[PDB]
Amino acid sequence: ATFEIVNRCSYTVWAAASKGDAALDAGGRQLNSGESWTINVEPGTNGGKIWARTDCYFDDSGSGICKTGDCGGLLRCKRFGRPPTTLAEFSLNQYGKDYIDISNIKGFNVPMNFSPTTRGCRGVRCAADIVGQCPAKLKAPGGGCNDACTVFQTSEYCCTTGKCGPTEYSRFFKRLCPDAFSYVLDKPTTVTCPGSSNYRVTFCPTA
């Protein structure tokens, strides 16, 4: 499957793509404002994620640091990124269908649209100004808006027992972005697409 990753932000981002124990495609790349990077994701990939990283420095070997979404200091990510990270999430070719969503469960750093480029389903978007509106206690001094699990490490925020409810913090993310996951047991906003659909992830879709 093809994923075109487009940076419409006015700032550079370092795109990342992983399934947690491996890179997807090259795993990461710099995208200056306006640039597009097309990756290939193997059919059947379960639990894949794409995200943006901000304010990164990499040396000649591809090792360094980012302020949001750092994946063990690598340009080419093999693992998931450090919160806060807005997440495009997908599982492909699962009994004949693909499943996509956007999640704020690991916080929010960059606005994003995640849409099919082929027929048969609708996209999702989380493009509100979550960083600007972020509750004071969730603001990441490194940049972005942390989720409450990251900040407070409680069973209720992290859904550790599988029994949790919405919270003041999850409701903030849900109010700003109704069509993204705000906590682990949120009413799902997953979209079912045809199996083997192709996609576009656009950072800063509104400008």
Question: Could you give the topology of this structure?
Answer:
Elements: E1 2-7, E2 13-18, E3 23-31, E4 36-40, E5 48-58, E6 64-68, E7 87-94, E8 97-103, E9 112-116, E10 124-126, H1 130-133, H2 148-152, H3 155-158, H4 168-176, E11 191-194, E12 199-203
Parallel strand pairs: 1-12
Antiparallel strand pairs: 1-4, 2-3, 2-5, 5-6, 5-7, 7-8, 8-11, 9-10, 9-12
Summary tags:
Thaumatin I, Thaumatin, seven-stranded antiparallel beta sheet, 207 residues, Osmotin/thaumatin-like_sf, five-stranded mixed beta sheet, monomer, 11% helix, globular, cytoplasmic vesicle, mainly beta
Total of domains:
1
Order of helices and strands: EEEEEEEEEEHHHHEE
* Class of secondary structure makeup: mainly beta
Cα-based radius of gyration, to the nearest Å: 16 Å
CATH fold name, please? Thaumatin
Task: Give me the CATH superfamily.
Answer: Thaumatin
Q: Based on the structure given, which CATH architecture is correct?
A: Sandwich
Q: Can you count the helices?
A: 4
**Which range best describes the helical content: under 10%, 10-25%, 25-40%, 40-55%, 55-70% or over 70%?**
10-25%
Number of strands: 12
For the terminal residues, how far apart are their CA atoms? 27 Å
Keywords: Cytoplasmic vesicle, Disulfide bond, Signal, Taste-modifying protein
Organism: Thaumatococcus daniellii (Katemfe)
InterPro entries: Osmotin/thaumatin-like_sf, Thaumatin, Thaumatin_CS
Subcellular location: Cytoplasmic vesicle
